[PDB]
């Protein structure tokens, strides 16, 4: 009872709950998946619309040429955090005149969440990643959770109802490094619509999707330009 | 715990307890009667109980971890009519924070939302909403999460 | 007696008979972990003895100590929580550094407990922060005034002494060493080190080895804070 | 830390501020405070509380202050705060006369000061000034002038007020026995012994259980003076034999 | 960061509770007493150490501020260290800026203002001491009081600390204005003595005088001198 | 720094503090206001005399501008607050636009003032509503009364303050064009309204009237108990 | 550094297939003495990229601390990823820059060069912030007595060798000795390609020929 | 109510916030740390929360600088953020005193930083544990530790995590004192996988490490060929 | 106790959502997006004759060719209607191009949700706003309608309606609203709901409209004109 009203007031068990909540608060939103092959990367996204009239909500953003990410949580937070990755890339693009090694942004991005956790009145990102980029050590997908703690994945899918997506891809983890693009992005639709609820099917209306390679920008697919990737499903 | 305070009625309970700690461990040793206790709070027992012979043993159970949420889950389904399609592994993953009392919750409701939809046999979707209700979750009015 | 008035037993602030029961608590402290020294001041020497537990075969028994040099001349004894402990060596060893930086001489002991108490004191009266759990014993020559033997407490207490204990078993050996300067000088040679070792025993009831005691020594003919080795302390053990 | 904040600074269900009630409710308890405007003069009379064999007498004063060459006040509630509160008014007085070179008008100077204790009561966080004031001076725009202020910040002019222990019966003789505007200071400084008398119920005037001041015009200059003990004796003496042969 | 609210807050009947606390435990202290003789002017405490192994010099009560003002106290000893420094610097901060000796009402004013500010302030508590001041400053003896509210009070003759109702009894018998130096640091010895569980030998009181020569402790030697009456 | 946050939503979306604000702005003497076809008048009512304050000092209708004034009701260090800060504001205005300020600009920056302070961290709202009146320069005659809350609308005729609903329904039932028809008419009219609470009148009111280019109107005792037995 | 103190003279590198070859003097001088007379002036950054340095030599140190800090740092991470010559390149730009606009300029005209990835590198940056790449450089007085001849024979052979650049280097270390003022006999010559860095001993300019 | 900061006494004298913090560091999995005379060897037990992670998530070694290696245990977001405390505490002190910084100094340095932490209402202990330890020709090699309250002491052997005990049993019959990392490391391979515990988790893959002789001075991860031949001796250990 | 920034046990920041809770107390307003225009339509909510209803300014325009209707309190869009028109004006002066309406709506939602109490400024915001508006506008990508609620979360929207009644409103709008209205059957639409969700009957002194088209800039409806659309209303 008193020990979830600050982020900086252990439980007697060594937990703390506030940023447990937050985690709650990354997974009570949309569905979203990442893949690696040998060669791209793919992110593949559902988006839910408050009523009929409104229009579904993005939820894949550009970072740079070679990084996108796909979020699932509260929006701030998820444009405050492409705010800080677009001005690391920058940076890095000025002073380096290269692109910024991946893994190293996910660094920087754990570290940045890692302060609110620590200090009192601070409340941690509720929002949640998947980061999907090409660096010269090839394609990576990483994911990172309102507790400043990121994951090196080859697949994974945040979210609610996230874990039929996710047995779907443990399932099927062998192809991925061998797949086409074709093959790899089929794979991630497929796995989100195990995601979605019986009777309602993947749509131009409810998908978006994101890629990087090896001599391709990253991309967003989305509105009736998905239809060439649903067409075949 | 024993403390000082002007308040009466806890010194009777303090007195029975007492009397079993003598009883336990004692003048007159007694060597062919063992005792067993269950708490949910041991932070509040006296250290004269769980002094080291009277009680000797302590046994912790946690909270049961993702293997052990399959295995209760499959005991407890074990006499009901269950398709050969869920995956055992995906419920344990997706109930995080599930005491051990807590499949019979989500097994029995499930088989009790197979019976509301008049089905005969269960299938993913039946714990699915069983465990939809065992969480016990309400709503915002709103989803502006995205 | 023991009334309370909202957060005073949470925070440093009075309560209502005029008692500050953080800090009688970070006194609690002071004997969490199980050690106690003892001082002693002769009359050409001065001597910090402290027990040395090696609580297992895995630990380095070089490193684990409670003997350390704020300056060349100066050296203490540091009992209660370790951590707080080597706070309050780091700050003590930056003052005397500093003192000898602006002032251009060595850094009295005296003053060195004053400026630390000081900041003890600080600490006792704002109530964001709490107050340390570990108490100090200084020992070394003034040019004019003789050994010197000082010690400090959470609270800010910085009183000189003839001969001191610190820790758990504080009274005992404070009775001890009462008894003792009563009774002649309370050791008068540099054959302290033989009446500290007793107190020690005698308190504790040990029969110390050896490899189980730390000692320290300052002597008039050789003031630099020395750090008694093994096989001195062993001649010593011998000794009585 | 909220575990701890006291939230001095807040509105109650009610729209009261409690801090600020209870900073008045100290007032209530201090040595009584008179004031009474004549048409030649203003005064101060407030009761001496440090009633002692042991006490040393320093100063000029013990509650008065000198804040100008034309101004004077005096205090009820907290000691330290009360010092605190003269320094400042004192600097406002010094930055006023030295921006202008004028003295400071009254009004100008009191609603200085309540505006420091008004804005220490909006924000942050503080406990405010258990004070509360009473003024005397003269400027060239309402003369001889008796001001009053409170822990809210609220001041108000009064040809005569009280401020402090029994506040309502001081007042209610105040009332009961002022003749506005035919007033001279020897009859104002009569009244003020009369309603003190009353007021300190504890025993009678002993000519060193109070203390009195004046401020009048002369010689074209300001003039601030405390009552000795031979004039104030023997006012008390004149008001007892008023009294003997009234009845 | 530090907390930026005041700790002390006026009670539902207007009193602020932890300045009476402080209060309190300055009650509950050693005790200690001033006298303001007609050619000096006389402090003088209680200061038995625990055990025989505290060294009587190895700190004093009764520490002066300039050559000719010093101050003793009765209550915690860490907040008269700390009020000690504090006075010694706004002594020489008066003396850098008007280049003459500060006088003991303003340095009393001003310690005062000091301890009113930790009354107010916030994320801290009062100060648990209260101070005698004695100055010889224009010819003439002062004798001065300091409490944890910040008030001060000119005092002819007081006695603060343990069982300081029936030390104020005492002195309120034996004051004479017309007292010299000598009789009146007697007094003092005696009031001390009214209540001391003990034998006063040298080594457990302490006293400091002030006169035109200057405010300066005594001698213990000097002190068991005195005492022998 | 003091960084608390004083003000704070809570469940069913309520600001509490702005509420006990307008809850103590409904402890304060009666405001009226109403506007005719030339002539403001802005109506208090004074608590009592009291035969010993100067009621110089205890002003209540206060000016901000040669062409605009104000009045409030409930606690008074906020309203002395508002008032220097609207005086600032207005002459600040003359100074860069050259052109004197309007009755509704100096009604949104205090509004904004209020909001500031509601919305902030560590500072308690104010407790005040005012009723500023006025002519701008194309001499159209105004009315804006501004919330705790930081809101302000317009009006031909408000009573803001202790017994606000039953003013307010006075001049509700009343207001007509033949009540405005004549200045004199007008200000008969505020002083009935105000009759409603207050219990002496003459010695328990304080009047203003303002015109075009006539400065502010105080009236006088004798004059204001002229006007009511007129009224009589 | 508003006034050089102790400083080193002209630094040249050409490059070739397989790599760059860069040479420089030891000496500092103390304006036309010849003071610290054993001081290199070549240093290697990373695996794949060196550095010479003309001017105060004090500044030289730093940069050569800052950097190696640097390479010292992201060899820490062994995230897979190493800064390539034309990264040290940039941020050297950037620095430079960054403090000449701060009116407190680093006095060293500075020459990079590196081979990585199958391709050579070879870059200047001066105290004020200007940077180019070119495939011979010169700094100081080499840039008017050794230039020209680089220049030359790369103009009339495109792609040089290993022994060709070598010998190219020697002679215009030579012309320097000769008509360059405050030079030293000394030398040092780095040369990167795919195995490393490597700086050979105090090579002298022993042919000298003096037919007066 | 007096275990809501760290800066409140229990009335017995304990920071109980500060008990919690390590608490928490027995949930983690377990890492050791063995000297000898040639260096020091690190190995830990990470364990695979799912299937679909590569080799090498979140590594629980890192290098604070290239003579020093951390082994961490606990939340890992402190972990990280000590660890980059620690490399700016290296790359400072080579900055100003000129050398590769003595490695207790660091240690003492981290501690510091860490019980800095454990005093104040306005933050919270870290809940991590770790182990710092280098080789050089000089200070020879060096084992330290550093728990939540900010305590360093020198080991010769430790276990930081959740079978910290049955490790510690184990650790204490190696002998370290005469061997070298080589054997060492076939040793911590050995105590890595007596302590872990296959009914309660999954399955793990080992991260190993070492800095001593064999390396001149530099801390590094154990090549493949190494880990997996004593990966294999582990696994036949354990029959 | 329970500091602003704090997560329930769902995962949702507590004053975020009793400030959603806030804009039901508001009046109802309504927009329709049309490919001839968008226009608003707005309740006035006069609760007393004797208030000049001209004073109630309730519909602004950010822009000739932006406008904002709001829902909640009137005292707290008035820093995001100026932060909206600073904006807009700042991307006129740098690029000399028309800021764009997904960009403002951008712009004002980020504004939103920066509230804290640990280490911000001298005076930052401290509770969430608790307004809800409406940007629509014709941008060079034609008519645009947006809907922006108090957690920063902003959405493109064919038809909304936010208010007091603001549920039933929207079943309304989803039964007439389709793909091919006109401008002056959308307003004509927009006035039916309206007059019937208000308590008091339609009249012209008492709503406020406005459309704004590609010809035309932002257009308020005048008391004649209002009068003229309400009469065949």
């Not at chain 9, 209205?181 to 002194?205: D, F, G, H, P, R």
């Amino acid at each position: 009872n008193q020990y979830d009203n600050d982020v900086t007031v252990w439980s007697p068990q060594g937990r703390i709950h506030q940023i447990e909540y937050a985690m709650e608060a990354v997974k009570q939103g949309s569905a979203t998946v990442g893949l690696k092959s040998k060669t791209h990367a793919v992110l593949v996204a559902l988006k839910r619309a408050q009523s009929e009239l409104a229009a579904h909500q993005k939820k894949i953003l550009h970072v740079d040429n070679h990084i996108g990410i796909s979020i699932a949580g509260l929006t701030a937070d998820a444009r405050l955090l492409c705010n800080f990755m677009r001005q690391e890339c920058l940076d890095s693009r000025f002073v380096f005149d290269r692109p910024l090694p991946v893994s190293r942004l996910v660094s920087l991005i754990g570290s940045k969440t890692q302060i609110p956790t620590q200090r009192y009145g601070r409340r941690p990102y509720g929002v949640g990643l998947l980061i999907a980029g090409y660096d010269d050590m090839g394609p990576h997908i990483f994911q990172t959770c309102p507790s400043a703690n990121y994951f090196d994945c080859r697949a994974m899918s945040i979210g609610a109802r996230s874990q039929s997506a996710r047995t779907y891809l443990e399932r099927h983890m062998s192809e991925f490094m061998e797949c086409n693009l074709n093959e790899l992005v089929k794979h991630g639709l497929r796995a989100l619509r195990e995601t979605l609820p019986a009777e309602q099917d993947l749509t131009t209306k409810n998908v978006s999707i994101g890629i990087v390679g090896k001599d391709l920008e990253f991309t967003i697919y989305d509105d009736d330009d998905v239809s060439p990737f649903l067409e075949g499903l | 715990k024993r403390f000082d305070s002007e308040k009466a009625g806890d010194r009777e309970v303090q007195r029975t307890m007492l009397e079993l700690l003598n009883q336990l461990d004692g003048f007159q040793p007694n060597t062919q009667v063992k005792v067993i206790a269950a708490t949910n709070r041991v932070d509040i027992l006296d250290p004269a109980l769980l002094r080291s012979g009277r009680l000797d043993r302590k046994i912790e159970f946690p909270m049961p971890n993702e293997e052990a949420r399959a295995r209760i889950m499959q005991i407890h389904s074990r006499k009901m009519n269950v398709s050969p399609d869920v995956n055992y592994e995906e419920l344990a993953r997706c109930t995080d924070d599930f005491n051990g009392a807590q499949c019979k919750a989500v097994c029995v409701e499930a088989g009790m939302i197979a019976l509301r939809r008049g089905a005969t046999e269960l299938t993913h979707e039946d714990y699915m909403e069983g465990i939809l209700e065992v969480q016990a979750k309400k709503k915002a009015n709103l989803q502006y999460y995205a | 007696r023991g009334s309370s008035a909202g957060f005073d037993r949470h925070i440093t602030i009075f309560s209502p008979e005029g008692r500050l029961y953080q800090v009688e608590y970070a006194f609690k402290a002071i004997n969490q972990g199980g050690l106690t020294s003892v001082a002693v001041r002769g009359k050409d020497c001065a001597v910090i003895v402290t027990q040395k537990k090696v609580p297992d075969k895995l630990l380095d028994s070089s490193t684990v100590t409670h003997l350390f040099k704020i300056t060349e001349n100066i050296g203490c004894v540091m009992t209660g929580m370790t951590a707080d402990s080597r706070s309050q060596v780091q700050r003590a060893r930056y003052e005397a550094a500093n003192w000898k930086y602006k002032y251009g001489y060595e850094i009295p002991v005296d003053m060195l407990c004053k400026r630390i108490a000081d900041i003890s004191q600080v600490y006792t009266q704002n109530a964001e922060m709490r107050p340390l759990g570990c108490c100090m014993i200084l020992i070394g020559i003034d040019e004019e005034q003789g050994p010197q033997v000082y010690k400090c407490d959470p609270a800010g207490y910085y009183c000189g002494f003839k001969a001191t204990a610190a820790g758990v078993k504080q009274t005992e050996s404070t009775s001890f060493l009462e008894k003792k300067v009563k009774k002649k000088f309370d050791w008068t040679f540099e054959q302290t080190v033989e009446t500290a070792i007793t107190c020690l025993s005698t308190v504790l009831s040990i029969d110390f080895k050896p490899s189980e005691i730390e000692v320290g020594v300052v002597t008039v003919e050789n003031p630099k804070f020395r750090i008694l080795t093994e096989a001195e302390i062993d001649a010593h053990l011998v000794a009585l | 830390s909220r575990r701890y904040d006291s939230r001095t600074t807040i509105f109650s269900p009610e729209g009261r501020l409690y801090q600020v009630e209870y900073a008045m409710e100290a007032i209530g308890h201090a040595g009584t405070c008179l004031g009474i405007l004549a048409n030649d003069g203003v005064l101060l009379a407030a009761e001496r509380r440090n009633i002692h064999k042991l006490l040393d007498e320093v100063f000029f004063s013990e509650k008065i202050y000198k804040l100008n060459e034309d101004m004077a006040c005096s205090v009820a509630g907290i000691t330290s705060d009360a010092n605190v509160l003269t320094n400042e008014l004192r600097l406002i007085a010094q930055r006023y006369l030295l921006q202008y070179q004028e003295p400071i008008p009254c009004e100008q100077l009191v609603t200085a000061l309540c505006d420091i204790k008004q804005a220490y009561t909006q924000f942050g966080g503080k406990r405010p000034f258990g004070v509360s004031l009473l003024y005397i001076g003269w400027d060239k725009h309402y003369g001889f002038q008796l001001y009053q202020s409170d822990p809210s910040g609220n001041y108000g002019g009064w040809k005569a007020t009280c401020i402090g222990n029994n506040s309502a019966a001081a007042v209610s003789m105040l009332k009961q026995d002022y003749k506005e505007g035919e007033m001279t200071l020897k009859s104002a400084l009569a009244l003020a012994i009369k309603v003190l008398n009353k007021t300190m119920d504890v025993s009678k005037l002993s000519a060193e259980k109070v203390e009195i001041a004046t401020l009048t015009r002369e010689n074209g200059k300001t003039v601030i003076r405390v009552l000795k003990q031979k004039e104030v004796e023997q006012l008390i003496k004149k008001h007892e034999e008023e009294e003997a042969k009234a009845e | 960061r530090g907390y930026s609210f005041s700790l002390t807050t006026f009670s539902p009947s207007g009193k602020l509770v932890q300045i009476e606390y402080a209060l309190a435990a300055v009650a509950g202290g050693a005790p200690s007493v001033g006298i303001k003789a007609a050619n000096g002017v006389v402090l003088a405490t209680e200061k038995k150490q625990k055990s025989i192994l505290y060294d009587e010099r190895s700190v004093h009560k009764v520490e002066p501020i300039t050559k000719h003002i010093g101050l003793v106290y009765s209550g915690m000893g860490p907040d008269y260290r700390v009020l000690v420094h504090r006075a010694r610097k706004l002594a020489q901060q008066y003396y850098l800026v008007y280049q003459e000796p500060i006088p003991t009402a303003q340095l009393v004013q001003r310690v005062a203002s000091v301890m009113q500010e930790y009354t107010q302030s916030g994320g801290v508590r009062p100060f648990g001491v209260s101070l005698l001041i004695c100055g010889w400053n224009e010819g003439r003896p002062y004798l001065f009081q300091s409490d944890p509210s910040g008030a001060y009070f000119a005092w002819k003759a007081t006695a603060m600390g343990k069982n300081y109702v029936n030390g104020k009894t005492f002195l309120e018998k034996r004051y004479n204005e017309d007292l010299e130096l000598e009789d009146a640091i007697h007094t003092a010895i005696l009031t001390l003595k009214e209540s001391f569980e003990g034998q006063m030998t040298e080594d457990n009181i302490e006293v400091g005088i002030c006169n035109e020569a200057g405010f300066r402790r005594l001698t213990p030697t000097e002190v068991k001198d005195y005492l022998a009456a | 720094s003091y960084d608390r946050a004083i003000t704070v939503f809570s469940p069913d979306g309520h600001l509490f503090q702005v509420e006990y604000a307008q809850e103590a702005v409904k402890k304060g003497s009666t405001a009226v206001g109403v506007r005719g076809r030339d002539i403001v008048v802005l109506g208090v009512e004074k608590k009592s005399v009291a035969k010993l304050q100067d009621e110089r000092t205890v002003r209540k209708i206060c000016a901000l501008d040669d062409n605009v004034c104000m009045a409030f009701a409930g606690l008074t260090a906020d309203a002395r607050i508002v008032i220097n800060r609207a005086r600032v504001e207005c002459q600040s205005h003359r100074l860069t636009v050259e052109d004197p300020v309007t009755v509704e600009y100096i009604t949104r920056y205090i509004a904004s003032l209020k909001q500031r302070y509601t919305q902030s961290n560590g500072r308690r709202p104010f407790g005040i509503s005012a009723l500023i009146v006025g002519f701008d320069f194309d001499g159209t005659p105004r009315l804006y009364q501004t919330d705790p809350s930081g809101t302000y609308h317009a009006w031909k005729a408000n009573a803001i303050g202790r017994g606000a609903k039953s003013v307010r329904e006075f001049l509700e039932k009343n207001y007509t064009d033949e009540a405005i028809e004549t200045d004199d008419l007008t200000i008969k009219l505020v002083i009935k309204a105000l009759l409603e609470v207050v219990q002496s009148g003459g010695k328990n009111i304080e009047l203003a009237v303002m015109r075009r280019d006539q400065s502010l109107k105080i009236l006088n005792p004798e004059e204001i108990e002229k006007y009511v037995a007129e009224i009589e | 550094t508003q006034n050089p103190m102790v400083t080193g003279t002209s630094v040249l590198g050409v490059k070739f297939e397989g790599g760059v070859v860069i040479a420089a003097d030891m000496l500092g001088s103390y304006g036309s003495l010849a003071r610290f007379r054993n001081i290199s002036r070549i240093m290697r950054v990373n695996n794949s990229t060196m550095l010479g340095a003309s001017g105060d030599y004090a500044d030289f140190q730093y940069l050569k601390q800052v950097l190696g800090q640097m390479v010292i740092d992201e060899e820490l991470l062994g995230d897979g990823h190493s800064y390539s010559p034309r990264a040290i390149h940039s941020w050297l730009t950037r620095a430079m820059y960054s403090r000449r606009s701060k009116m407190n300029p680093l006095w060293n005209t500075m020459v990079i060069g590196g081979y990585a990835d199958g391709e050579s590198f070879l870059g200047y940056v001066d105290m004020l912030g200007v940077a180019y790449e070119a495939p011979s450089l010169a700094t100081g007085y080499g840039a008017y007595l050794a230039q020209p001849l680089l220049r030359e024979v790369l103009e009339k052979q495109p792609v040089l060798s290993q022994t060709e650049a070598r010998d190219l280097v020697e002679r215009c270390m030579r012309v320097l000795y000769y008509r360059d003022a405050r030079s030293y006999n000394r030398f040092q010559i780095a040369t990167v390609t795919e195995k490393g860095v490597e700086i050979e001993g105090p090579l002298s300019t022993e042919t000298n020929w003096d037919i007066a | 109510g007096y275990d809501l900061s760290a800066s409140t006494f229990s009335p017995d004298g304990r920071v109980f916030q500060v008990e919690y913090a390590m608490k928490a560091v027995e949930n983690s999995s377990t890492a050791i740390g063995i000297r000898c005379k040639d260096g020091v060897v690190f190995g830990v037990e990470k364990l695979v929360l799912s299937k679909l992670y590569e080799e090498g998530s979140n590594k629980r070694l890192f290098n604070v600088d290239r003579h020093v290696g951390m082994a961490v245990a606990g939340l890992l977001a402190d972990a990280r953020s000590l660890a980059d405390i620690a490399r700016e505490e290296a790359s400072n002190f080579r900055s100003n005193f000129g050398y590769n910084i003595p490695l207790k100094h660091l240690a003492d340095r981290v501690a510091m930083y860490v019980h800095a932490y454990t005093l104040y209402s306005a933050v919270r202990p870290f809940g991590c544990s770790f182990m710092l330890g280098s080789y050089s020709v000089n200070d020879g090699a060096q084992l330290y530790m550093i728990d939540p309250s900010g305590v360093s002491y020198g080991y010769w052997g430790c276990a930081i995590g959740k079978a910290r005990q049955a490790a510690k049993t184990e650790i204490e019959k190696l002998q370290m004192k005469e061997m070298t990392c080589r054997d060492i490391v076939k040793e911590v391979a050995k105590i890595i996988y007596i302590v872990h515990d296959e009914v309660k988790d999954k399955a793990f893959e080992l991260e190993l490490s070492w800095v001593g002789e064999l390396t001149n001075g530099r801390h590094e991860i154990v090549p493949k060929d190494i880990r997996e031949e004593a990966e294999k001796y582990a696994k036949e250990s354990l029959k | 106790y329970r500091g602003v920034n704090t997560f329930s046990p769902e995962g949702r920041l507590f004053q975020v959502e009793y400030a959603i809770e806030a804009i039901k107390l508001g009046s109802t307003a309504i927009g329709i997006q049309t490919s001839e225009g968008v226009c608003l339509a707005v309740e006035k909510r006069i609760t007393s004759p004797l208030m000049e209803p001209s004073s109630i300014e309730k519909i602004v325009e950010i822009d000739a060719h932006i406008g904002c209707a709001m829902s909640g309190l009137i005292a707290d869009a008035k820093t995001l209607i100026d932060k909206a028109r600073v904006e807009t004006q700042n991307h006129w002066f740098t690029y000399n191009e028309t800021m764009t309406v997904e960009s403002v709506t951008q712009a004002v939602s980020n504004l939103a949700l920066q509230f804290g109490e640990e280490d911000a400024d001298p005076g930052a915001m401290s509770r969430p706003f608790g307004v809800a508006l409406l940007f629509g506008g014709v941008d060079e990508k034609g008519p645009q309608l947006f809907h922006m609620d108090p957690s920063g979360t902003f959405v493109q929207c064919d038809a909304r309606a936010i208010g007091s009644a603001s549920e039933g409103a929207q079943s309304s709008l989803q039964e007439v609203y389709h793909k091919s209205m006109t401008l002056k059957e959308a307003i004509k639409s927009s006035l039916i709901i309206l007059k019937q969700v208000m308590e008091e009957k339609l009249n012209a002194t008492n709503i406020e409209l406005a459309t704004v088209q590609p010809g035309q800039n932002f257009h308020m409806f005048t008391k004649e004109e209002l009068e003229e659309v309400i009469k065949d209303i």
